[PDB]
Structure 1
Amino acid sequence: QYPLSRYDDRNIADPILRAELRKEVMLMCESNDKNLTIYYVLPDEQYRPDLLAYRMWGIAELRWVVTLAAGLEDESQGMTVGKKLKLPPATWIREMIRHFQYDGQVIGTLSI
């Protein structure tokens, strides 16, 4: 058995159900919250989102967040150098992943 890092989006096995978590992450990345960080794409990070993920958070498995926020479907498509990105912290991402892995309900559900 090969364990998957706790920061991987592959932790949800269905590509359709992962869409809700991706939507939540993208919606947060475009907001104007007060504990985001502003990062510009450097000239040596055009094709390598892993380098950006390591330089910002210190974790290399968070490259899917960088690919999502930049606006690309493919990792081989180059990013625009100098694009302004806003990226959330890591504990928030881990908490969202845990919630959607073990509960899997919409953020605004009403229960009794």
Structure 2
Amino acid sequence: TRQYPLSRYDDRNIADPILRAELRKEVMLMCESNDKNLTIYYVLPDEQYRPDLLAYRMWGIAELRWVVTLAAGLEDESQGMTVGKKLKLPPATWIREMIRHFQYDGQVIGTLSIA
């Protein structure tokens, strides 16, 4: 039959490490920005091994695991992150839209003035 395995969630859908790099750059900018459209929640003790566990409970998807990993700056899940750290999550559809734009026409990125 006609079947192909894929999933339209991976931020790493972009094969360029450098492009993935600036992607995580601006998502970090926004996350450690104090924008109100971000979530307001601290750390859980068991998040040391499983940072995406909170992502699963509040969203049901593990796609936010790299988001929280870059938010916490963890070297490894073997080490833990301090409980109570300020953690911020934006609406997922917003990330979906930005990545959609970036992988169809993520050309100007910064600012478009006029055609």
Shorter-chain TM-score bucket reads 0.7 to 0.9
Q: Pick closer, same or farther for the CA change 1:50–1:100 going to 2, 3 Å.
A: same
Larger Rg: 2
Structure 1: 5+ residue stretches without partners: none
User: Does structure 1 conserve the Cα–Cα contact (< 8 Å) formed by 2:31 and 2:88?
Assistant: yes
State the Cα distance separating 1:8 from its structure 2 match: 1.5
Structure 1 distance, partners of 2:30, 2:13, is 20
User: Does structure 2 conserve the Cα–Cα contact (< 8 Å) formed by 1:36 and 1:89?
Assistant: yes
The list of structure 1 runs, each at least 4 consecutive aligned residues, that deviate by more than 6 angstroms after superposition, is none
Structure 2: 5+ residue stretches without partners: none
Where 2:12 maps in the other structure, the secondary structure is helix
Structure 2 distance, partners of 1:4, 1:80, is 35
Q: Which piece of structure 1 moves more, 53-62 or 12-21?
A: 53-62
Structure 1-normalised TM-score?
0.83
State the Cα distance separating 1:13 from its structure 2 match: 0.5
User: Does structure 1 conserve the Cα–Cα contact (< 8 Å) formed by 2:28 and 2:71?
Assistant: yes
Deviations 1:23-71 (A, max 9, x none): 1111111222221111211112122012121122221222111101111
User: Does structure 1 conserve the Cα–Cα contact (< 8 Å) formed by 2:102 and 2:109?
Assistant: no
How many residues are paired up? 112
Q: Which has the higher strand share?
A: 1
Structure 1 distance, partners of 2:106, 2:37, is 25
Structure 2 distance, partners of 1:85, 1:55, is 15
Structure 2 distance, partners of 1:38, 1:111, is 34
Q: Which piece of structure 1 moves more, 99-108 or 83-92?
A: 99-108
User: Does structure 2 conserve the Cα–Cα contact (< 8 Å) formed by 1:38 and 1:85?
Assistant: yes
Report the RMSD for the aligned CA atoms in angstroms: 2.1
